[PDB]
Amino acid sequence: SMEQVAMELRLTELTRLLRSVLDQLQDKDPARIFAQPVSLKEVPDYLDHIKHPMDFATMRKRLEAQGYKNLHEFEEDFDLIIDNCMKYNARDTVFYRAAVRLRDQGGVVLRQARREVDSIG
């Protein structure tokens, strides 16, 4: 059907839009603190503290697998990155502060992304 292709044209172009967005958010973490998942061999109790671990490499796999069916899904993952860190790592750590800054710098990007999603459809 021509109808299913048109939704596939739409998901494809979304994934292209979100690929730009992700690249912008990852530019706001120049330390690459949120680049890969938190190793379990290096932090063995981590999963006792955090229930849904999340990172930029993991969000990228799901993207190229056209796994994000809206911006809300995409936002929830990014917030986990931030929120899981700000639970695990205390106030006076480079890790905590790295998510606080990312969150603040990411909200500019994610504001204009919401306007492009709606406008384009």
What profile does the largest beta sheet have?
A: none
Secondary-structure element series: HHHHH
How many DSSP E strands? 0
Query: Architecture, according to CATH?
Result: Up-down Bundle
Supply the number of structural domains: 1
Which class do the helix and strand fractions yield?
mainly alpha
CATH C-level name: Mainly Alpha
Helical run tally: 5
What is the CATH H-level superfamily?
Answer: Bromodomain-like
Shape: globular
CATH topology: Histone Acetyltransferase, Chain A
The fraction of residues in strands falls at under 5%
- Helical content, roughly? 55-70%
Terminal CA distance:
21 Å
Radius of gyration: 16 Å
Domain Bromo: 9-113
Cross-link (Glycyl lysine isopeptide (Lys-Gly) (interchain with G-Cter in SUMO2)): 41
Subcellular location: Nucleus; Chromosome
Protein name: Bromodomain-containing protein 1
Walkthrough of the structure:
This protein has 121 residues and is an all-alpha fold. The chain has one domain: Up-down Bundle (Histone Acetyltransferase, Chain A), CATH 1.20.920.10. The chain is built from five helices and no strands. Helix 1 (2-27) runs antiparallel to helix 3, helix 1 (2-27) runs antiparallel to helix 5 (94-120) and helix 4 runs antiparallel to helix 5. It comes from Homo sapiens (Human). It is found in: Nucleus; Chromosome. This is Bromodomain-containing protein 1. Residues 9-113 form the Bromo domain. There is a cross-link at residue 41 (Glycyl lysine isopeptide (Lys-Gly) (interchain with G-Cter in SUMO2)).
